[PDB]
Design a protein around this ligand. Structure first.
Ligand SMILES: COc1cncc(-c2cccc(CNc3cccnc3N)c2)c1
Length: 374
């Protein structure tokens, strides 16, 4: 795991990527690590934003599955050809697997102009794979064909990171790991059973927090909350920070807020605690997020020279998404073998002058199942 430490590059803004090699002889690509999707899909044609792409026909081990795939989003898509090839992770375990690969032949609003990655490693489960759940996701192939344990953990830093494949590295976190159950193997779905701001219960029905699901998603920048929860949260963060006025635009992620370099008044901004369903009946634990995780610094803007931040909490269309902004505070263990997700304070988390992040428990929370939306 020493050899996997620091094997990710990038930021929460454009995502985190891992080097992979596909085919024979090996072709080296940077691949977004995305726990909110389940396809392994790589640029396979010279889209102008791409540094590198997959040239199937130069791989002696490529096998055309003679089947297309099509994945749409709200305002875009990617599209391509399914096949299999030999895959590896230079700074991963010392194995080669034959995996399903979607050779992206055409796409729209998918690749980010200026990014240094060319594909997507969908680490979530087969149920949300495209074109259907019979397209075995990458991690499933890795585990089936090798003795690599069926887990991985992510330490996302910035504001790069590490993906430890096959276990847990003690040196990437402090304190103890607490585990929340994966509710259904599709997205990494979890249950938020309670939310607090500076220790103050947000006081809503916990079904609101998971309406219609809550997921851990390294392919999303922000903490995203459902509409009602988002409004409750912002009102409360306004209240804790009412000694200053901010434009409405700020709370909508449209405008920055700046202070004289070094004078950002962090104390004004509250810690958010999300309680997660525990492994034991009526037991939960809490993860504590600090303002320096949801106030994301904004660098050279037009031409900026102060200290400036945008609000990295946003409204959710499809439930609570624990994006990179949240994951960046923690070492997140995706224990697929035991249907569970572990959190511990990250060794690389941004500290704050007077407050320290935490993962802690146990708490008693009755009727936690009822926080699940059905
Ligand atoms: C922080 O990770 C990202 C930041 N910016 C863009 C992406 C990105 C780009 C293209 C496709 C995808 C697919 N995955 C999504 C998309 C939307 C929401 N969640 C996920 N997992 C991500 C990831």
């Amino acid at each position: 795991f020493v050899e996997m430490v620091d094997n990710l590059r990038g930021k929460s803004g454009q995502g985190y990527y891992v080097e992979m090699t596909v085919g024979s002889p090996p072709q080296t690509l940077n691949i977004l690590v995305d726990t909110g999707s389940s396809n392994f899909a790589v640029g396979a044609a010279p889209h102008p934003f791409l540094h590198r792409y997959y040239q199937r026909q130069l791989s002696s081990t490529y096998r055309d599955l003679r089947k297309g795939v099509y994945v749409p989003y709200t305002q875009g898509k990617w599209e391509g050809e399914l096949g299999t090839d030999l895959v590896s992770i230079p700074h991963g375990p010392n194995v080669t697997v034959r995996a399903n690969i979607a050779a992206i032949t055409e796409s729209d609003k998918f690749f980010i102009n200026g990014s240094n990655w060319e594909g997507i490693l969908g680490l979530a489960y087969a149920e949300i794979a495209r074109p259907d759940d019979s397209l075995e996701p990458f991690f499933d192939s890795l585990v089936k064909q090798t003795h690599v344990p069926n887990l991985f953990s992510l330490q996302l830093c910035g504001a790069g990171g590490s993906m430890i494949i096959g276990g847990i590295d003690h040196s990437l976190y402090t304190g103890s790991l607490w585990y929340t159950p994966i509710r259904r193997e599709w997205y990494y779905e979890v249950i938020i059973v309670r939310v607090e701001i500076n220790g103050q219960d947000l006081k809503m029905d916990c079904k609101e927090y998971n309406y219609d699901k809550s997921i851990v998603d390294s392919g999303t920048t922000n903490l995203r909350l459902p509409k009602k929860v988002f409004e409750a949260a912002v009102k409360s963060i306004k209240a804790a920070s009412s000694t200053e006025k901010f434009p409405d635009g700020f709370w909508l992620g449209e405008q920055l807020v700046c202070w004289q370099a070094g004078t950002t008044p962090w104390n004004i901004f509250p810690v958010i605690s999300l309680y997660l369903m525990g492994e034991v009946t009526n037991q939960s634990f809490r993860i504590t997020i600090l303002p320096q995780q949801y106030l994301r610094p904004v660098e050279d803007v037009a031409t900026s020279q102060d200290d400036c931040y945008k609000f990295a909490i946003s409204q959710s269309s499809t439930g609570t998404v624990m994006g990179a902004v949240i994951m960046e505070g923690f070492y997140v263990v995706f224990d697929r073998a035991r249907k569970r997700i572990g959190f511990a304070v990250s060794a690389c988390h941004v500290h704050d002058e007077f407050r320290t992040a935490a993962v802690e428990g146990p708490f008693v929370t009755l009727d936690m199942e009822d926080c699940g939306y059905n």
